[PDB]
Ligand binder design. Structure first.
Ligand SMILES: Nc1ncnc2c1ncn2[C@@H]1O[C@H](COP(=O)(O)OP(=O)(O)O)[C@@H](O)[C@H]1O
Ligand SMILES: [Mg+2]
Length: 682
């Protein structure tokens, strides 16, 4: 009929009560030494299921895991973050629901120096025997008998450079006996609560989300049928390959979820730029004038860096279905992490500054002018970019706009609740673009990740549906892409034209500095010195032969599965080469290197159980083998690796392709008889 319940469900999704969240957290014990926030039985926790039966089912599983990760956030800040303590003078209190709101005062300089805002959780402690003689730290709070968590509710600047604070605590907490009028109470920040609150909102409002069924069942919509001519038109107009054009036309033509799988270097972000232009132009091509809200598209990614990349790439405009550029109005919601004038000029705050000028350089007017400008800028916008978390910001929630279409880049690098946040504005189409063949996003709680909390929604949906695959890679030399294609993509991942020309390098003319080589080191620990020695000797040969012609600054990375090996690798490289290699070689584990790439990569394999185990090894090998563009030198002991199918496949593939070399310390030295004798007899 007439579904005014859309407005009612919108209202529910945007006004979830946070009090139940703080009913839990404000009864936690900051001093608790545990992986878990309380002593409830471990069986209250369970794995993220592949398939959920209802919103209540989802909430039963997911809420403990969200709170577990939040607990670990408290512990990590307590045990590492060295937040700076301060003190307050207590005033009156007011009972509200299951809470006390406690009023206090503190100097503005202290609020600034200690970085306190209305988003923060703090901890209070009673430390009557403290003397200013000593420096106070969060260790003093961790060891204190009497502590109490408090949520900063309100901060109001007063006349004398002071601030009126409202702190919220739990009614039940015995610490209120210390909060007598005019008492001095010591405090330290625990953590910012914004990210948690937004995820909790999504979790608890889930039943009202338009796409709740597809979420619970992790079931994207079925493909519809699309015109071949339309795909050809998009291919030509957007300068895309076939797989990219198919992914755009199919995913925009249907409602609900679509998954676009992009291996390394296959144009995930480029395809999103095509989605934006194609969506906006086909939507713009659908007795007094009616007033309509302007269609928008909401574009998100997990991190500030990924959002800024999209923003930067949109500044060259987007294109309509006929290939003509147009310049839609773009707003970046949320300040970025980095400083970039290109990104700054797109942020809502700067667009407001430019819209209102120096008129208010009187405070009533300044705030009003800013709010009117904000409303105008958002109303006339075509594209809103934000992080997933930032999509929940007040500035979007107060626009009165349905974002029926949401696009998510880097969609495998977020927890599930995070990917759902932007769907709260009536999301009926969600196109998620990601690479599932990488390590899952890092979470602080190992216990939570053992329950699969570290799994994206994309990955859960991939179990039930085949994504649109982007099948041409534009980064790696063909000798480097060959085995990843055959081993992980059925040989169907192609190279862009001229990958051999683009990635040809001068050292490729000197064996064994080839584009692709497995070095079988002829020689239950997690380190191997002989692999380090061979890595050093390869890089030394490279440098001796080429560093009077080529600047190796930023060109090399050395990775391994194991941190023990990389500690030893860095130590030996530092001893042998001294400070001269700092700017040339980055050292990390495979896991730590996931978002990085280099012209030259050396892998120290060291050595090679379950399905969870095989999955982590599959992801690590996908990552390791795609980090290099021009040269990848894989160092290992064949017998110590061949118990893994992945490594045995890699080694036998390399033999088949004549890309296996025998190595040992001294093998590049013709005068080293001891080494040439080891080699010769082989
Ligand atoms: N269809 C294409 N034709 C030519 N180059 C392409 C194509 N698609 C992607 N590329 C190139 O691939 C590289 C990575 O593109 P990008 O959109 O950053 O991919 P990803 O987001 O998947 O890392 C860029 O150099 C881009 O120009
Ligand atoms: Mg990208």
């Amino acid at each position: 009929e007439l579904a005014k319940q859309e407005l009612e469900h919108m209202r529910k999704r945007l006004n979830v009560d946070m009090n139940p969240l703080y009913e839990i957290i404000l009864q936690w014990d900051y001093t608790r030494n545990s992986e878990y926030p309380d002593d409830e039985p471990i069986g209250n926790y369970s794995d993220v299921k592949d398939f959920f039966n209802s919103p209540a089912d989802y909430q039963k599983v997911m809420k403990p895991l969200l709170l577990l990760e939040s607990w670990q956030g408290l512990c990590s800040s307590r045990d590492r973050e060295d937040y700076k303590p301060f003190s307050i003078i207590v005033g009156n209190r007011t009972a509200v629901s299951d809470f006390y709101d406690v009023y206090a005062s503190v100097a503005k300089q202290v609020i600034q120096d200690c970085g306190i805002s209305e988003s923060d959780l703090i901890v209070m402690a009673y430390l009557p025997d403290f003397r200013p003689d000593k420096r106070l730290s969060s260790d003093d709070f961790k060891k204190a008998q009497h502590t109490c968590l408090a949520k900063v509710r309100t901060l109001k600047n007063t006349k004398g450079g002071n601030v009126d604070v409202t702190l919220r605590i739990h009614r039940n907490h015995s610490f209120s006996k210390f909060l007598t009028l005019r008492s001095e109470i010591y405090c330290v920040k625990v953590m910012q609560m914004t990210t948690i609150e937004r995820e909790y909102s999504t979790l608890e409002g889930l039943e009202y989300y338009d796409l709740v069924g597809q979420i619970l069942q992790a079931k994207p919509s079925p493909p519809v049928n699309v015109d071949a001519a339309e795909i050809e038109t998009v291919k030509k107009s957007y300068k895309l390959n076939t797989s990219q054009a198919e992914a755009i036309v199919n995913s925009v033509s249907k409602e609900g979820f679509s998954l676009i799988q992009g291996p390394p270097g296959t144009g995930k972000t480029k395809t999103i730029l095509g989605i934006i232009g194609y969506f906006l132009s086909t939507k713009n091509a659908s007795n007094t004038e009616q007033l309509l809200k302007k269609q928008k598209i909401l574009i998100c990614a997990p991190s500030n860096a990924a959002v800024d990349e999209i923003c930067l790439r949109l500044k060259s405009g987007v294109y309509d279905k006929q290939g003509h550029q147009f310049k839609p109005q773009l707003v970046r919601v949320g300040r970025s992490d980095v400083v970039n004038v290109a990104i700054k000029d797109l942020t809502l705050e700067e667009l407001v500054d430019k819209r209102i000028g120096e008129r208010n350089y009187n405070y009533r007017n300044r705030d009003l002018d800013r709010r009117n400008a904000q409303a105008h800028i958002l109303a006339v916008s075509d594209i809103i970019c934000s992080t997933l978390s930032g999509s929940a910001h007040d500035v979007l929630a107060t626009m009165g706009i349905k974002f029926d279409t949401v696009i998510i880049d880097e969609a495998c690098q977020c927890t599930e609740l995070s990917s759902i946040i932007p769907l709260r504005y009536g999301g009926k189409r969600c196109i998620m673009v990601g690479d599932p063949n990488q390590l899952p996003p890092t979470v602080l709680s190992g216990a939570a990740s053992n329950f699969k909390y570290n799994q994206s929604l994309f990955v859960r949906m991939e179990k039930n549906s085949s994504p649109y695959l982007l099948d041409v890679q534009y980064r790696m030399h063909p000798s480097i892409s060959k085995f990843p294609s055959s081993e992980f993509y059925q040989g169907r991942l192609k190279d862009g034209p001229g990958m051999d020309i683009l990635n040809k390098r001068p050292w490729h003319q000197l064996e064994p500095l080839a584009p692709y080589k497995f070095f079988d080191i002829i020689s239950m620990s997690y380190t191997n010195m002989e692999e380090i020695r061979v890595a050093i000797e390869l890089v030394d040969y490279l440098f001796r032969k080429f560093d009077n012609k080529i600047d190796f600054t930023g060109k090399i990375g050395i990775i391994s599965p194991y941190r023990e090996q990389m500690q030893k690798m860095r130590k030996e490289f530092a001893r042998y080469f001294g400070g001269m290699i700092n700017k040339s070689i980055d050292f990390n584990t495979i896991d730590g290197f996931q978002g990085q790439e280099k012209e030259i990569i050396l892998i120290s394999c060291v050595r090679a159980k379950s399905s969870v185990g095989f999955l982590k090894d599959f992801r690590r090998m996908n990552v390791a083998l795609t980090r290099a563009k021009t040269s990848i030198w894989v160092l290992g002991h064949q017998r110590s690796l061949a118990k893994s199918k992945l490594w045995r496949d890699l080694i036998e593939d390399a033999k088949d392709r004549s890309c296996l070399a025998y190595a040992c310390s001294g093998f590049l030295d013709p005068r080293n008889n001891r080494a040439q004798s080891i080699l010769r007899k082989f």
